Write a protein that binds this DNA or RNA. Structure first.
Ligand code: MG
Ligand code: MG
Ligand code: MG
Ligand code: MG
Ligand code: MG
Ligand code: MG
Ligand code: MG
Ligand code: MG
Ligand code: MG
Ligand code: MG
Ligand code: MG
Ligand code: MG
Ligand code: MG
Ligand code: MG
Ligand code: MG
Ligand code: MG
Ligand code: MG
Ligand code: MG
Ligand code: MG
Ligand code: MG
Ligand code: MG
Ligand code: MG
Ligand code: MG
Ligand code: MG
Ligand code: MG
Ligand code: MG
Ligand code: MG
Ligand code: MG
Ligand code: MG
Ligand code: MG
Ligand code: MG
Ligand code: MG
Ligand code: MG
Ligand code: MG
Ligand code: MG
Ligand code: MG
Ligand code: ZN
Lengths: 175, 142, 38, 209
RNA sequence: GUGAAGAGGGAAACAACCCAGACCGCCAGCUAAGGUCCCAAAGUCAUGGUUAAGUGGGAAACGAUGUGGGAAGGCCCAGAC
RNA sequence: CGAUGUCGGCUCAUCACAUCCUGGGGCUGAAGUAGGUCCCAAGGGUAUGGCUGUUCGCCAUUUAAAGUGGUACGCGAGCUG
RNA sequence: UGCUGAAAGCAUCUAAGCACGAAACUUGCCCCGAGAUGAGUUCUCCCUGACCCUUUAAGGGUCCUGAAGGAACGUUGAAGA
């Protein structure tokens, strides 16, 4: 609807290929590909992508608005990239990177190693901070969710892996 | 006079190939059970098998509507006391996909010795190929 | 997770959402308010 | 990995230096020689067919003796078959020695157990005997009740009752191999394998590791 | 009113419900209730809607931005939400 | 009612899940340990004695736990009496 | 429990798409198992005679032939009523 009516402007240096329902968006940061729902009609009006309900479908504007914000995110991913920052709160908690294997040390009896996916690159500025970058927004949010999932932050001290921007509602242990 | 009956020695039967890609399960199966019974022939006789041999291929690509791909359940019982078993539709396609067409048609044929003889003419295949080129089967469109 | 027959908004931050055929109350503020109709 | 066909020689013990007595089962393993190599193009699966021992020449039948003559090998006392893993192959007339188990550590020994004959439910299914006194009328080792009243006019399938015990294929898993003596064709596994003395055994490397 | 003392058809099976009262014969026709995808006789009928729950094909107080239709209202290109 | 043997024990059981243990979770007035509570889950496991005809119950001492029910208050052409 | 994400400029685990998640489920382990009448597969072995017949057909008979193998018998078994 209101999201889908607003067209997505392709910048310069961003190659867009429409192919049925398959759309490959290239750029200086990589290529991204997504098969759309069959309820979505996509067409390139020479500087913008537009998004209309294909006929004979119930959720016309609902599927189109999903198809808008994805290809909006595919454009921003191939010209800027996404960057999700994580920090580690807790004594002795740290992280190290070996190419694409983040080596977490989260107070377990066993080492924690996380294999990174394909288009995702990570970096630790500090031992208690993880910064990971990449193109696809769904994937960097997934990797950030996986690294958060090892130590979901305790409400009594905020201890554990958190997002660098989120708020952690704490709790006092009463007596 | 008396009403004609078909005779099992003089009856002739034919061969058909049906492609089951994308077709609805029950709407395919009722046309197979119509043609295995022999109710498309004017010389139909209830106590005589007058139907046609039918080869069904691409049995793993049959389609069902709704949520029945994950919610239609095929129960059976092994005879032993805990022996209730259970498989969903998409597990049956992965495990042994020929049974799905076979179970649907077997429920639509008559029950008895003749209905089991009608089921022997249904020859289903998961793949896109068959060893029955020697019988010269025609392409049946359903 | 409260599981009830009657699920209701308990504060201003409750949001009634239907996830997979189940009416669910989720609250960003209070974890006591999260509900599930069952 | 394939296994080998041996024979239960008997049991003995290996005194270690440390003062530990290991109860071992001597399994002589003669040279298993392959008789047929099975593959995907002809047979649908990958396996080999081996033979061991000797057999009286007047007793091996013409269908059976022709099967050894195609492989070109002496007739053995039986024919067994071992499924092949991938990347593992054998020729037809190849002989396989007990040095195959030189570097395994646990094996599974499959044999036919001893025949207990028609056994009652005290012996077979470990039922409790009833009371040997206090009034018991002719019912000291009987199975007792076997069902319920009218709800299931019937005894269920697989009800534990009397019948044949033993004389059947059983497999003891994860037996520690003690010694592999290639010179006199032996194989010492820790513990007791199924079968009587002199019966055929199938020794395979342990699948549960 | 039916059964008892009443068969036939339908309701899976089902004295008492629904349709209908068996003098006999027929390898004739029309209908009733109930039905017409297959088991199983007859519409894969037509036109216009509704449902996405296998609801249909078992149940309440109560709960819910499920969804379809209608009538009204207060905010609103003086810029709302 | 021209016979459907009955309380408890014994010996075989078998099913349900409204779960006692073990498994997975949510919330906690959840620091940890240990809990409370609810959700999912029936795969396996699930005492021995004292007293009493007892089921039950109390008591002693165990155990990860000593589940609740259906089964003609399961089971006498199997036993006990 | 999530990720991305609209319908509903926000929000949202879901409607499209994706990820994780239990002794349950299907496998993995063991055993039976082609009467699986849908009766499967592989390998090897054995038989390469003459004639009559009328109702001429998956026909009946004669003489010659008797294989591979099996069965019976005997000695028996850590197999067995
Ligand atoms: Mg779910
Ligand atoms: Mg409840
Ligand atoms: Mg014996
Ligand atoms: Mg006793
Ligand atoms: Mg007596
Ligand atoms: Mg006695
Ligand atoms: Mg009785
Ligand atoms: Mg019965
Ligand atoms: Mg009377
Ligand atoms: Mg009547
Ligand atoms: Mg009637
Ligand atoms: Mg009824
Ligand atoms: Mg009837
Ligand atoms: Mg008419
Ligand atoms: Mg009518
Ligand atoms: Mg019938
Ligand atoms: Mg019909
Ligand atoms: Mg129509
Ligand atoms: Mg405003
Ligand atoms: Mg009486
Ligand atoms: Mg009587
Ligand atoms: Mg439950
Ligand atoms: Mg808890
Ligand atoms: Mg069970
Ligand atoms: Mg149990
Ligand atoms: Mg079960
Ligand atoms: Mg299991
Ligand atoms: Mg007691
Ligand atoms: Mg009762
Ligand atoms: Mg009783
Ligand atoms: Mg009980
Ligand atoms: Mg009794
Ligand atoms: Mg007395
Ligand atoms: Mg959004
Ligand atoms: Mg979100
Ligand atoms: Mg998974
Ligand atoms: Zn709230």
């Amino acid at each position: 609807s209101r999201v889908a009516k607003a067209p997505v402007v392709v910048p310069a240096g961003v190659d867009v290929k429409i192919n049925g329902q398959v759309i490959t968006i290239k750029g200086k940061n990589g290529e991204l590909t997504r098969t759309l729902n069959d309820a979505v009609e996509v067409k390139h009006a020479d500087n913008t992508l537009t998004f209309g309900p294909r006929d004979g479908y119930a959720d016309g504007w609902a599927q189109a608005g999903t198809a808008r914000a994805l290809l909006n995110s595919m454009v921003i991913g191939v010209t800027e990239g996404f960057t999700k920052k994580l920090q580690l709160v807790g004594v002795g908690y740290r992280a190290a990177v070996k190419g694409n294997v983040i080596n977490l040390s989260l107070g377990f009896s066993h080492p924690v190693d996380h294999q990174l996916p394909a288009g995702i690159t990570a970096e630790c500025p500090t031992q208690t901070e993880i910064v990971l970058k990449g193109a696809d927004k769904q994937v960097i949010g997934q990797v950030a969710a996986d690294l958060r999932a090892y130590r979901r932050p305790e409400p009594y001290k905020g201890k554990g892996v958190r997002y660098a921007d989120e708020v952690v509602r704490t709790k006092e242990a009463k007596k | 006079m008396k009403t004609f009956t078909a005779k099992p020695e003089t009856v002739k039967r034919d061969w058909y190939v049906v492609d089951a890609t994308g077709k609805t399960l029950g709407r395919l199966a009722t046309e197979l059970a119509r043609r295995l019974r022999g109710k498309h022939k004017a010389e139909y006789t209830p106590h005589v098998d007058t139907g046609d041999y039918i080869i069904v291929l691409n049995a793993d690509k049959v389609a069902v509507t709704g949520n029945k791909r994950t919610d239609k359940v095929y129960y059976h019982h092994t005879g032993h006391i805990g022996g209730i078993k259970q498989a969903t539709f998409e597990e049956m396609i992965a495990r042994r996909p020929e049974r799905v067409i076979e179970i649907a048609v077997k429920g639509m044929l008559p029950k008895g010795p003749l209905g089991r003889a009608m089921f022997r003419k249904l020859k289903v295949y998961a793949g896109n190929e068959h060893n029955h080129a020697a019988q010269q089967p025609q392409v049946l469109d359903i | 997770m409260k599981v009830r027959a009657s699920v209701k908004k308990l504060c201003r931050n409750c949001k009634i959402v239907k996830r997979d055929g189940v009416i669910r109350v989720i609250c960003s503020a209070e974890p006591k308010h999260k509900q599930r109709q069952g | 990995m394939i296994g080998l066909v041996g024979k239960k020689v008997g049991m003995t013990r290996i005194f270690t230096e440390d003062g530990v007595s290991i109860p071992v089962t001597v399994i002589e393993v003669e040279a298993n020689r392959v008789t047929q190599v099975k593959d995907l193009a002809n047979d649908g699966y990958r396996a080999i067919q081996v033979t061991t021992g000797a057999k009286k020449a007047n007793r091996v039948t013409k269908p059976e003796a022709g099967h050894f003559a195609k492989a070109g090998v002496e007739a053995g006392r039986g024919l067994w078959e071992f499924r092949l893993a991938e990347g593992e192959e054998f020729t037809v007339g190849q002989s396989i020695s007990v040095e195959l188990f030189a570097d395994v550590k646990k094996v599974d020994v499959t044999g036919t157990s001893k025949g207990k004959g028609f056994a009652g439910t005290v012996k077979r299914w470990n039922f409790r005997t009833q009371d040997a006194t206090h009034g018991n009328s002719l019912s000291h080792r009987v199975p007792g009740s076997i069902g319920q009243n009218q709800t299931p006019g019937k005894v269920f399938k697989g009800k534990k009752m009397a019948g044949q015990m033993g004389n059947e294929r059983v497999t003891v898993q994860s037996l520690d191999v003690v010694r592999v003596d290639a010179e006199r064709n032996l194989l010492l596994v820790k513990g007791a394998v199924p079968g009587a003395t002199g019966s055929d055994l199938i020794v395979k490397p342990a699948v549960k590791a």
